[PDB]
Design a protein around this ligand. Structure first.
Ligand code: 2U7
Length: 89
């Protein structure tokens, strides 16, 4: 029960989120939430942090989100953790 519109939001990552995104995607100043979620998704799968829990205490992603692990099924929490690392444009 998250709206579809949320993936349209325009955002400006803070430096550490930007560092992580640069490892998987082109470097722009502005991203859609859709893009951010995809890049983070690819980052996680590429680095195999996920086998419904993502484990990230041995990874920069852990520092980014402030948790050692999280559930992929809890989307509102994920959006919340993402939002602390960006500015809405
Ligand atoms: C790395 C985990 C990826 C995998 S996936 O969708 O890309 C695929 C099934 C294609 C392999 N992921 C999920 O597995 C879960 C699947 C689900 O529980 O519905 O969806 C995650 C998702 C999608 C959209 C928004 C949010 Cl906040 C999270 C989504 C996700 C979780 C965390 C982050 Cl940071 C980004 C995307």
């Amino acid at each position: 029960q998250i709206p579809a519109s949320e993936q349209e939001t325009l955002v400006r990552p803070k430096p550490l989120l930007l560092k992580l995104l640069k490892s998987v995607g082109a470097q722009k100043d502005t991203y859609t939430m859709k893009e951010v979620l995809f890049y983070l998704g690819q980052y996680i799968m590429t680095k195999r942090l996920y086998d419904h829990i993502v484990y990230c205490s041995n990874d920069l992603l852990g520092d980014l989100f402030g948790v050692p692990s999280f559930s992929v099924k809890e989307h509102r929490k994920i959006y919340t953790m993402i939002y602390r690392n960006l500015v809405v444009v």
